[PDB]
Design an enzyme around this catalytic site. Structure first.
Site, PDB file in Angstrom:
ATOM      1  N   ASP A 271      36.363  -1.045 -42.361  1.00 44.56           N
ATOM      2  CA  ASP A 271      36.179   0.160 -43.299  1.00 44.56           C
ATOM      3  C   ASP A 271      36.803   1.114 -43.298  1.00 44.56           C
ATOM      4  O   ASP A 271      37.285   1.677 -42.220  1.00 44.56           O
ATOM      5  CB  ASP A 271      34.373   0.282 -43.292  1.00 44.56           C
TER       6      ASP A 271
ATOM      7  N   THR B  42      35.356   6.104 -50.007  1.00 42.53           N
ATOM      8  CA  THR B  42      36.485   7.002 -49.473  1.00 42.53           C
ATOM      9  C   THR B  42      37.788   6.623 -49.563  1.00 42.53           C
ATOM     10  O   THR B  42      38.678   7.031 -49.935  1.00 42.53           O
ATOM     11  CB  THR B  42      35.967   7.289 -47.712  1.00 42.53           C
ATOM     12  N   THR B  43      37.788   5.269 -49.074  1.00 42.48           N
ATOM     13  CA  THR B  43      39.129   4.458 -49.278  1.00 42.48           C
ATOM     14  C   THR B  43      39.611   4.461 -50.537  1.00 42.48           C
ATOM     15  O   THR B  43      40.812   4.705 -51.023  1.00 42.48           O
ATOM     16  CB  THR B  43      39.209   3.188 -48.685  1.00 42.48           C
TER      17      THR B  43
ATOM     18  N   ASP C  31      22.544  -8.732 -45.469  1.00 44.86           N
ATOM     19  CA  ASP C  31      23.444  -8.049 -46.507  1.00 44.86           C
ATOM     20  C   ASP C  31      22.968  -8.431 -47.775  1.00 44.86           C
ATOM     21  O   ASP C  31      23.263  -7.470 -48.752  1.00 44.86           O
ATOM     22  CB  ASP C  31      24.895  -8.739 -46.363  1.00 44.86           C
TER      23      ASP C  31
HETATM   24  N1  LIG Z   1      32.050  -9.384 -54.308  1.00 42.85           N
HETATM   25  C1  LIG Z   1      33.254  -8.637 -54.399  1.00 42.85           C
HETATM   26  N2  LIG Z   1      34.229  -8.904 -55.226  1.00 42.85           N
HETATM   27  C2  LIG Z   1      35.003  -7.909 -55.602  1.00 42.85           C
HETATM   28  N3  LIG Z   1      35.295  -6.830 -54.948  1.00 42.85           N
HETATM   29  C3  LIG Z   1      34.192  -6.340 -54.438  1.00 42.85           C
HETATM   30  C4  LIG Z   1      33.164  -7.253 -53.690  1.00 42.85           C
HETATM   31  N4  LIG Z   1      32.415  -6.475 -52.846  1.00 42.85           N
HETATM   32  C5  LIG Z   1      32.787  -4.980 -52.919  1.00 42.85           C
HETATM   33  N5  LIG Z   1      33.984  -5.093 -53.650  1.00 42.85           N
HETATM   34  C6  LIG Z   1      35.081  -3.772 -53.678  1.00 42.85           C
HETATM   35  O1  LIG Z   1      34.699  -3.264 -52.534  1.00 42.85           O
HETATM   36  C7  LIG Z   1      35.246  -1.589 -53.153  1.00 42.85           C
HETATM   37  C8  LIG Z   1      34.437  -0.624 -52.256  1.00 42.85           C
HETATM   38  O2  LIG Z   1      34.408  -0.927 -51.073  1.00 42.85           O
HETATM   39  P1  LIG Z   1      35.144   0.251 -50.031  1.00 42.85           P
HETATM   40  O3  LIG Z   1      35.216   1.348 -51.108  1.00 42.85           O
HETATM   41  O4  LIG Z   1      36.108  -0.252 -49.424  1.00 42.85           O
HETATM   42  O5  LIG Z   1      33.961   0.901 -49.125  1.00 42.85           O
HETATM   43  P2  LIG Z   1      34.222   2.000 -48.162  1.00 42.85           P
HETATM   44  O6  LIG Z   1      34.261   3.111 -48.851  1.00 42.85           O
HETATM   45  O7  LIG Z   1      33.019   1.878 -47.210  1.00 42.85           O
HETATM   46  O8  LIG Z   1      35.502   1.649 -47.203  1.00 42.85           O
HETATM   47  C9  LIG Z   1      35.224  -1.730 -54.625  1.00 42.85           C
HETATM   48  O9  LIG Z   1      36.094  -1.581 -55.173  1.00 42.85           O
HETATM   49  C10 LIG Z   1      34.814  -3.181 -54.726  1.00 42.85           C
HETATM   50  O10 LIG Z   1      35.699  -3.557 -55.837  1.00 42.85           O
END
Ligand SMILES: Nc1ncnc2c1ncn2[C@@H]1O[C@H](COP(=O)(O)OP(=O)(O)O)[C@@H](O)[C@H]1O
Ligand SMILES: Nc1ncnc2c1ncn2[C@@H]1O[C@H](COP(=O)(O)OP(=O)(O)O)[C@@H](O)[C@H]1O
Ligand SMILES: Nc1ncnc2c1ncn2[C@@H]1O[C@H](COP(=O)(O)OP(=O)(O)O)[C@@H](O)[C@H]1O
Ligand SMILES: Nc1ncnc2c1ncn2[C@@H]1O[C@H](COP(=O)(O)OP(=O)(O)O)[C@@H](O)[C@H]1O
Lengths: 483, 500, 494, 384
Positions: free
Chosen positions: C45, C78-79, C356
């Site tokens: 992450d 955040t990312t 999850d």
């Molecule tokens: N099943 C899924 N299919 C497509 N995209 C997903 C799925 N689950 C999560 N995402 C993507 O994950 C992203 C958010 O996660 P992320 O921002 O990387 O978490 P963190 O902020 O903790 O790093 C969203 O833009 C979403 O599109």
């Protein structure tokens, strides 16, 4: 030995992209500083200053393939390159060069007998212009653009089906003449050799005429000198106009006095003779070159049939048709914006007519577009396990070398190579031999060529495989030389 | 070099070379763009505004530059109007597609996208072009001249421009046989005013010391034909040479009545110091004539050509209507008007200020070009970078529909189509971005015929501003630019063969 | 060498983004983070990456500070916020290279964000109603997909959706606040996972507490203790006196966490108590809060009506044992999920999938305003803002247009990290959302997400990938603020 | 960079794998260690090769760490693990240059791993348990080619008796085994035949003056971390101990003669200067309990342990024998000889065979060595 393999790899890579209908044409500048843009691989190899003696062997093999079949040259190049790559990795494994050579020879022997078992031959004959033209479509489709293929096939076939006599054909009979100007669609099929002329004092209805060939192109004292020059010129034109001469050609320009004296003999004056036209005339009518004006003779003189001016193409042209065979020579008129694309179209026409000539002596057709290559790869790699010993590695590498042709044909078309190869190979078990690589779709999809009519000759594929294998073998048996 | 190898690096180099070549003609777009000075070696600096002239005299050595220059020259030769537009548009295509090349977009995909986008644009143009030819242009030509004076609107010649426009189109209508720029030539004369500038249906050349010898010629002569002589006219064996010279001098007078030519032409010098010697001959003569005058006389009057000293022919005094020799600005000028094939119209560039040659040759030439091009074709579209904006909007709207690689490429094509109005308003000197933004807004929502106004520096409805450009020439220019871009993109290798 | 500190700042932000760019999405690649001492860290992450990345540039400092405060605000994003901010900075730098003053760009960005939040608020989804269950079950299946339990995933999804919605614990000011710790795991030996069934209460697999426990109890009082009832040498010998004293107060079912008692068999019949050792602290705390009870260590002196209530205790053969089914508590906290199979060792992956799925379902149920994931929102916003920028007409056209174009970086990186042709996927998503505007009848084509499994466009509301509206809105706000702040810091020469 | 970092990681993997690629099998080649002082080391073991060498790349350090963690978990095979990891990461180079993503490579690798697990479990030959025949066959197979060939006759039966001394019956049938709880007693001196086995914990510490009731016929051990002092003016802890009436109470502090008398008044035997690695095994083998908080003090503070205690001063040194322990999970194994240079290796290979035995209890399976299993699974995958 790895130096030789590297050189051959580079020379195969430099022409790998031009393969297939989506070949990326290159810019060509020769020593006299022209500027071509050509997708024809043989043309690229002509202007490549290849000095490495190892790659010279593959170049000679390609020349032999072109000299005998006239197409598949770049196939020979890419196949030899892939074969040398895989032989190099086998050597790096630890296999001796002799074992690799033996395996390659065994695999080529197997492929030569596997090949005639996947043929869907020609329909009925070289006649039926529409059908045979449909057969001749793929070569022109690949060599030049894929758009005007539907018209180029008809233009190149209507001329070649004129004389299917006794099953004998010659490439030089189907000649091509340049007429700049309008677009390609304005091109057509005409009969007999054609080029430009200047004068208009021509006679249409002509019996067996007489050609004169010029190998060398053109106060009272001043008046007397002018009279002497005039009388000498008149004597020369009388001496060249004797014995019932009717047509004269010269490589120079026109002169008002010269054309006046020619017309006063009811003789037209033909000029603008190219450096290549005189030999073609001499061979087509059995004529000879006369250096000066003073030695004209009846014996050293060739014979034509009909000469007249044709306005086809929005320009004046001369015609020398109905030769001794009365139908042997058959030209093709070409129209284009410039001369740069003229050469591409003439090479496409040649690469079609030579395929027709090959088809004359062999009615066998093979599914192209990578179908036969992947089929051969599957057959050989299946045969590999049936052969234990040290040659199985070389046989498998031969199969992977056949695998290279669709790989290149895809990667030079904006498609993931591994994806399409895997899809082709998987489909090819159930969706059998007649399936190949589709070009239209940007998505890596496959398409049957038996329905799509994308086919290539059996003899060409056979000879190309043989020559490529021989080149790879003869370049693997070289140790070194000081350089 | 710098990475001239397989695939991407060479395409990048070619795109950069095309950008460099377009930068040499970038600022000359528009009727009032910048101007360039080119020195031709020995020190004859060349000054010119038109882009095609600049391109024709460049020193291109790069293969990409050469294969863009040849396309530009072919476009100019096929149609004389619009050369710097196709090069600039093609370079913009290449520069807009370049940031997509290093990402692995295979150039064949770019070729396919460019071709389909060009086909769509050519199709779209046909649904917008409007026919205006029949709407009172041949008869009741007020609309024709109303479009004509646009090349001289809001300038110092605003009051008198109607006279010149109406009179030049009067000349054009009576000479409607596919007029050419070379055979409709104008000449500048020192002195005078601009209001009284006139057009003689012929030639207007001043007689210099080596041009014409005898003065007060029989102007009211109704069969004057030119005689092209190719021998000199002006004046132990130490006496033999004197005798020969005297015999030659006596024989030079054998053409006075035996040949019977009112006007004689020669390429050898003529001496006005011997005017009284020529006054004995009592006939007009020509010498050191320019090739333009020669050709205009040949295809207008049909003067004969003589080689021998006593060359006698029946065309020495053939049928030509009238002879004219009237002083212009205090200096006598030769007018070979009155011809059976008098498809000539030489304009007297009368004016006290001598430096106006560039102004008149940039103004009246463009005006007559616009008139001729409006006459030739029937349907036109709004100019001033107006049709480009409409094509860009349509292509941008269509690109979002299609799924796949072609979407980004068609979007980049539409973005690249915007450079024509941007460059127009940049050469005009006003803030380009504001004009472009206002144009895009009002053009996407309001209307489809708004371009750039060069006078007030604001958006305007160029349709009612009478800025016409033929649909066919614009379509051809767009097709040529797209094809040049495709040809550049499709090339990825060069072969040298330097010496052996 | 460099020419503008604006350029230096934008390249610093771009480098920071590229560090975390590849980890966006659930299939993001890992990153190695080594310090000077040689220690190593593995991470997926982007929040963890940024929270301990060793940055060096002041612009990077600002960007990381904004990312960290956004994390403290809402958590996920955040990312995404860093990537979006970097893309905006790159595009704005490209604009200002074309002689557009940065203040017009900043105003355009602010207008674009103000319009984007409005567009989202009018084209979000609130299908998490009491009538929305197919979306929830499909979300559970999709989160439970790409596994060997996928065939059994339908039953698990059915058993978990009703489990979480039935145990919805109300809060002080009237919102549905499901506690994740209310759902408890319960391992099982023998039959495989393809026969699991929901249990409405906790039942520790342990020694039998008592044999006189009736199946249903009219009135019970949870008298939880910790000490072991034993004889020694309010009572010195804690066996009878305090037990009877608490029974007088009303204690019916005494929750003896400590060791068993040697004469409590009579007390388990006359009163109906229980004796179970080594009870999990979280489980006992939840079962006490499921009935409004608190843990009592001793009984020296609360005992009148504070002890929790039990409504039914099933004593039968469950999980091949005589389990104690303490269910039907006061508050909506008592539950337990059977974990069939053989042990907790070979079912670790499936139970982690259960956790999850629970997490994603509880995220969906909370913050009733939700938006589709998979980059659908980004494409829809780009399509809206392209029209909005042209409709504007001011000098902020290019600013708003580049803001619209920059939002496509999220689906682009999602497609790249999914090992697909990213340009094709983003183009397909953009084309699907084009018809959502040009065609007025295809309104319900707006949530076409990115199916990372097959790498093809996919209706995502049906699929079930969901994101809270607050997360996207506030992340967009912070990305705009960070881009603006970095873009203002430009007028330097060095 | 992109795939450049992947290529760098797997290049470090390759260049660290081939360092020890040559030192496996019964004919391992030797290696040279050149410390920056001039010394030179003969080495056959790749584990020491990796331990002594220094590396700078994090990938190499991580792989070395995983090789170690495999070493102290399952025993042997570290060289094979390193070689295999290097080989797979090297053959991934071809695909990582195909511009094709690492994720699909990862999925393919996981599928390959699952299929290899299946085909190993299919090809494995069964072995019997509690039978000395193929136990000695395995001794000939793997426990050989070590320094045990001269002392295999004793190592074999030492291990074969030791297999039934560390069993935990928690969740199934003797499937749990713990590794350090076996009471190792390595002492040089005498003949190697004196090495034997005993069921109980063997403590090398003893009371200074054993003039008290040390051994009782039912040791009910009580553990305590408190320190025994003179008296209350602490005898109060002893008085509280008297409440439950034990016979042995284990502490970790010194005991005086008057303290000895105060303890034997309660009839409890304490110990001093003992190790935690001894106290834990004492508690494991006896099932005792440690508690000192008065509130928590109940009848559970005393847990019966052994049933027979004995003290023998073999060679004027203080041994303590605790035989017949309640839980036979921490029991005595004896080692005798002259030098510990080989007996340690023989020991470690014997507990390697112990792990072999416990897995035989789980999966009584053997895979053909000498490259047989490797080529078998390669054929299985290639045909699959
Ligand atoms: N099943 C899924 N299919 C497509 N995209 C997903 C799925 N689950 C999560 N995402 C993507 O994950 C992203 C958010 O996660 P992320 O921002 O990387 O978490 P963190 O902020 O903790 O790093 C969203 O833009 C979403 O599109
Ligand atoms: N439409 C098509 N689709 C797929 N493959 C084609 C198509 N047309 C031609 N090909 C393949 O491309 C190859 C072109 O060969 P070519 O490069 O012309 O050889 P050479 O240049 O030596 O004559 C042929 O072998 C044919 O199989
Ligand atoms: N009066 C005008 N108002 C607006 N635009 C004009 C005007 N005159 C010319 N233009 C623009 O100039 C362009 C052509 O100029 P240019 O390319 O320099 O000359 P040419 O076309 O002869 O090469 C056209 O696209 C037209 O839109
Ligand atoms: N006598 C033998 N013949 C053939 N191979 C053997 C023999 N003894 C051992 N091996 C091989 O040695 C390999 C393991 O040795 P190695 O891994 O170097 O020891 P360690 O596991 O202690 O590092 C096994 O794969 C086995 O096949």
């Amino acid at each position: 030995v790895y130096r030789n393999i590297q050189a051959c790899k580079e020379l195969a890579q430099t022409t790998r992209t031009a393969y297939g209908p989506n070949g990326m044409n290159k810019m060509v500048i020769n020593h006299l500083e022209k500027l071509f843009v050509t997708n024809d691989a043989a043309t690229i190899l002509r202007e490549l200053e290849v000095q490495h003696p190892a790659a010279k062997m593959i170049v000679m093999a390609s020349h032999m393939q072109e000299q005998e079949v006239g197409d598949g040259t770049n196939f020979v190049l890419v196949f030899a390159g892939a074969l040398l790559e895989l032989a190099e990795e086998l050597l790096r494994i630890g296999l001796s060069v002799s074992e690799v050579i033996e395996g390659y020879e065994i695999a080529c022997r197997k492929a030569h007998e596997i090949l005639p078992n996947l043929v869907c031959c020609s329909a009925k004959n070289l006649r039926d212009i529409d059908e045979v033209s449909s057969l001749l479509r793929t070569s022109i489709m690949s060599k030049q653009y894929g758009n005007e293929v539907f018209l180029a096939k008809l233009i190149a076939q209507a001329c070649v089906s004129i004389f299917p006599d006794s099953g004998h054909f010659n490439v030089d009979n189907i000649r091509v003449c340049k007429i700049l100007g309008s677009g390609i669609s304005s091109s057509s099929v005409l009969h007999g050799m054609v080029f430009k002329k200047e004068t208009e004092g021509d006679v249409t209805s002509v019996k067996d005429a007489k050609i004169a060939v010029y190998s060398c192109p053109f106060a009272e004292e001043l008046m007397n000198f002018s009279k002497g020059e005039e009388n000498l010129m008149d004597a020369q034109v009388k001496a060249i106009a004797d014995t019932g001469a009717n047509v004269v050609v010269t490589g120079g320009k026109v002169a008002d006095m010269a054309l006046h004296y020619a017309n006063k003999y009811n003789i037209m004056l033909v000029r603008l003779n190219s450096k290549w036209d005189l030999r073609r005339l001499c061979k087509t009518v059995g004529a000879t070159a006369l250096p000066r004006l003073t030695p004209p003779v009846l014996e050293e003189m060739g014979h034509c049939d009909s000469v007249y001016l044709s306005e086809v193409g929005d320009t004046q042209v001369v015609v020398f048709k109905h030769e001794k065979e009365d139908g042997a020579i058959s030209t093709i008129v070409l129209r284009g914006s410039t001369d740069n694309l003229m050469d591409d179209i003439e090479r496409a026409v040649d690469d079609g007519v030579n395929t027709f000539k090959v088809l004359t002596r062999d009615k066998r057709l093979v599914p192209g577009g990578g179908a036969t290559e992947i089929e051969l790869a599957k057959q050989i790699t299946s045969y590999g396990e049936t052969c234990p010993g040290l040659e199985q590695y070389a046989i498998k590498k031969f199969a992977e070398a056949f695998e290279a042709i669709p790989r290149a044909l895809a990667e030079n078309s904006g498609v993931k190579a591994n994806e399409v190869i895997s899809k082709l190979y998987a489909v090819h078990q159930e969706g059998n031999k007649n399936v190949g690589l589709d070009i239209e779709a940007e998505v890596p999809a496959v398409k049957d060529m038996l329905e799509a009519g994308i086919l290539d000759t059996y003899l060409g594929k056979y000879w190309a495989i043989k020559l490529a294998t021989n080149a790879a073998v003869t370049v693997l048996r070289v140790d070194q030389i000081i350089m | 070099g710098t990475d001239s190898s397989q695939g991407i690096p060479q395409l990048v180099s070619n795109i950069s070379a095309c950008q460099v070549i377009a930068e040499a003609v970038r600022t000359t777009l528009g009727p009032r763009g910048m101007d360039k000075l080119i020195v031709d070696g020995r020190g004859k600096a060349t000054i010119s505004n038109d882009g095609a002239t600049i391109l024709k005299l460049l020193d291109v050595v790069h293969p990409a530059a050469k294969t863009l220059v040849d396309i530009a020259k072919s476009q100019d030769a096929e149609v004389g109007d619009g050369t710097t537009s196709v090069t600039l548009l093609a370079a913009e295509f290449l520069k807009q597609v370049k940031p997509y090349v290093e990402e692995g977009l295979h150039p064949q995909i770019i070729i396919r996208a460019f071709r389909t986008a060009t086909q769509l644009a050519v199709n779209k143009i046909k649904e917008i072009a409007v026919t205006v030819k029949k709407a009172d242009k041949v008869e009741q030509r007020k609309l024709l001249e109303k479009c004509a004076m646009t090349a001289l609107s809001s300038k110092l010649i605003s009051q008198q421009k109607a006279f010149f426009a109406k009179m030049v189109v009067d000349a054009v209508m009576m000479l409607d046989d596919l007029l050419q720029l070379k055979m409709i030539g104008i000449k500048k004369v020192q002195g005078g005013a601009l209001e009284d500038s006139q057009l003689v249906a012929g030639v207007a050349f001043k007689k210099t010391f080596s041009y014409a010898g005898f003065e007060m010629q029989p102007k009211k002569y109704h069969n004057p034909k030119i005689a092209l002589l190719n021998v000199e006219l002006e004046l132990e064996d130490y006496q033999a040479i004197v005798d020969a010279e005297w015999n030659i001098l006596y024989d030079k007078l054998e053409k006075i009545h035996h040949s019977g030519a009112k006007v004689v032409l020669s390429k050898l010098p003529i001496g006005d110091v011997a005017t009284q010697y020529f006054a004995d001959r009592d006939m007009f003569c020509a010498g050191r004539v320019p090739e333009e005058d020669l050709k205009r006389t040949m295809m207008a009057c049909g003067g004969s050509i003589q080689t021998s000293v006593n060359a006698l022919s029946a065309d020495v005094l053939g049928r030509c209507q009238v002879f004219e020799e009237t002083q212009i600005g205090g200096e006598r000028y030769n007018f070979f008007t009155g011809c059976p094939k008098a498809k000539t119209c030489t304009f007297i560039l009368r004016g006290g200020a001598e430096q106006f040659m560039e102004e008149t040759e940039r103004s009246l030439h463009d005006a007559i070009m616009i008139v001729r091009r409006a006459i030739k074709n029937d349907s036109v579209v709004a100019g001033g970078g107006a049709i480009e904006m409409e094509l860009s909007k349509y292509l941008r709207d269509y690109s979002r529909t299609i799924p796949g690689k072609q979407q980004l490429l068609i979007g980049a094509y539409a973005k690249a189509l915007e450079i024509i109005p941007r460059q127009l308003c940049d050469n005009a000197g006003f803030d380009a971005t504001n004009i472009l933004n206002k144009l895009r807004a009002r053009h996407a929502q309001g209307g489809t015929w708004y371009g750039v106004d060069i006078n007030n520096e604001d958006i305007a409805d160029n349709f009612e501003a009478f800025v016409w450009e033929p649909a066919m020439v614009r379509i051809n220019a767009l097709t040529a630019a797209s094809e040049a871009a495709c040809l550049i993109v499709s090339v990825d290798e060069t072969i040298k063969n330097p010496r052996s | 060498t460099g020419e503008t500190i604006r350029s230096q700042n934008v390249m610093a932000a771009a480098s920071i983004a590229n560090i975390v760019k590849s980890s966006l999405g659930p299939v993001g690649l890992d990153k190695m983070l080594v310090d000077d001492i040689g220690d190593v860290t593995i991470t997926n992450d982007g929040a963890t990456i940024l929270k301990l990345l060793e940055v060096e540039h002041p612009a990077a400092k600002v960007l990381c500070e904004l990312a960290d405060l956004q994390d403290k605000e809402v958590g996920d994003g955040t990312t995404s916020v860093v990537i979006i901010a970097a893309e905006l900075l790159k595009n704005a730098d490209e604009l200002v290279k074309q002689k557009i003053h940065p203040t017009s760009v900043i105003s355009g960005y602010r207008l674009a964000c103000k319009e984007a939040v409005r567009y989202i608020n009018e084209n979000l989804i609130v299908n998490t109603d009491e009538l929305g269950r197919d979306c929830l079950i499909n979300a559970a299946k999709t989160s439970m997909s790409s596994k060997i339990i996928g065939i059994n995933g339908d039953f698990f999804a059915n058993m978990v959706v009703d489990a979480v919605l039935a145990i919805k614990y109300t809060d002080i000011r009237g919102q549905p606040r499901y506690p994740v710790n209310s759902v408890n795991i319960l391992k099982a030996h023998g039959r495989s996972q393809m026969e699991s069934m929901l249990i409405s209460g906790y039942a520790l697999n342990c020694v039998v507490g008592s044999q006189g426990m009736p199946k249903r109890i009219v009135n019970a009082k949870i008298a939880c203790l910790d000490f072991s009832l034993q004889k020694t040498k309010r009572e010195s010998d804690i066996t009878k006196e305090r037990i009877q004293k608490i029974l007088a107060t009303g204690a019916n079912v005494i929750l003896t966490t400590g060791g068993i008692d040697d004469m409590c068999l009579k007390y388990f019949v006359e009163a109906g108590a229980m004796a179970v050792r080594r009870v999990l602290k979280r489980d006992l705390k939840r079962i006490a809060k499921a009935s409004g009870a608190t843990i009592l260590s001793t009984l020296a002196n609360f005992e009148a009506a504070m002890l929790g209530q039990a409504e039914e205790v099933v004593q039968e053969r469950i999980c091949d044992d005589e389990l104690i089914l303490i269910k039907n508590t006061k508050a909506r906290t008592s539950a337990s999920i059977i974990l069939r199979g053989a042990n907790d060792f070979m079912c670790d992956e499936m139970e982690r999938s259960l956790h999850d799925a629970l997490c994603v379902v509880k995220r969906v149920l909370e913050s009733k305003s939700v938006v589709p994931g998979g980059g659908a929102v980004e494409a829809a916003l780009s399509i809206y803002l392209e029209n909005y920028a042209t409709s504007m007409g001011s000098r902020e056209q290019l600013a708003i247009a580049e803001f619209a174009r920059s939002l496509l970086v999220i689906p682009n990186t999602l497609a790249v990290n999914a090992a697909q042709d990213s340009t094709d996927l983003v183009a397909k998503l953009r084309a699907f959302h084009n018809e959502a505007q040009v065609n007025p009848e295809r309104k319900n084509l707006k949530w076409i997400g990115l199916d990372l499994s097959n790498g093809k466009p996919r209706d995502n509301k049906q699929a079930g990938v969901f994101e809270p509206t607050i997360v996207k809105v506030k992340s967009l706000k912070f990305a705009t603020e960070a881009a603006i702040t970095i873009l203002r810091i430009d007028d330097l020469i060095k | 960079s992109g795939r450049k970092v992947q290529s760098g990681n797997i290049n470090a993997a390759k260049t660290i794998a081939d360092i020890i690629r040559t030192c496996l099998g019964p004919k391992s080649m030797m290696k040279m260690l050149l410390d920056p002082m001039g010394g030179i080391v003969m080495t056959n073991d790749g584990n020491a090769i990796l331990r002594e060498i220094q590396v700078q790349h994090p990938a190499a350090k991580s792989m070395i760490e995983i090789s170690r963690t495999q070493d102290e978990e399952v025993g042997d095979g570290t060289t094979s693990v390193i070689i295999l990891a290097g080989e797979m990461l090297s053959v991934a180079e071809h695909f990582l240059e195909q511009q094709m993503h690492p994720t699909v490579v990862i999925s393919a690798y996981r599928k390959a791993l699952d299929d290899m697990i299946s085909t190993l479990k299919k090809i494995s030959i069964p072995v019997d348990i509690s039978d000395s025949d193929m136990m000695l066959n395995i001794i000939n197979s793997s426990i050989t080619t070590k320094a045990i060939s001269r002392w295999s006759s004793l190592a074999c039966n030492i291990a074969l008796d030791a297999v039934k001394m560390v069993q935990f019956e928690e969740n199934g049938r003797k499937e749990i085994d713990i590794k350090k709880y076996a009471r190792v007693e390595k002492i040089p001196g005498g003949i190697i035949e004196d090495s034997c086995v005993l069921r109980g914990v063997m403590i090398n510490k003893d009371v200074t003056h054993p003039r008290m009731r040390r051994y009782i016929k039912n040791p009910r051990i009580v553990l305590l971390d408190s320190s025994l002092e003179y008296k209350k003016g602490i005898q109060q802890l002893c008085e509280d101990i008297i409440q439950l009436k034990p016979d042995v109470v284990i502490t970790e502090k010194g005991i005086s003669d008057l303290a000895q008398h105060y303890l034997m008044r309660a009839n409890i035997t304490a110990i001093r200067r003992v190790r935690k690695t001894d106290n834990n095994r004492i508690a494991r083998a006896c099932g005792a309990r440690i508690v000192s908080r008065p509130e928590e003090l109940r009848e559970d503070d005393v847990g019966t342990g052994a049933g027979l205690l004995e003290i023998k001063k073999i060679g004027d040194e203080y041994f303590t024998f605790i035989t017949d322990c309640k839980d036979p999970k921490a029991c005595t194994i004896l080692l005798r000889g002259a030098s510990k240079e080989i007996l340690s290796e023989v020991e470690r290979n014997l507990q390697d065979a112990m792990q072999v035995c416990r897995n035989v209890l789980l999966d009584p399976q053997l895979v053909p060595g000498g490259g047989a299993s490797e080529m078998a699974v390669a054929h299985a995958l290639t045909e699959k």
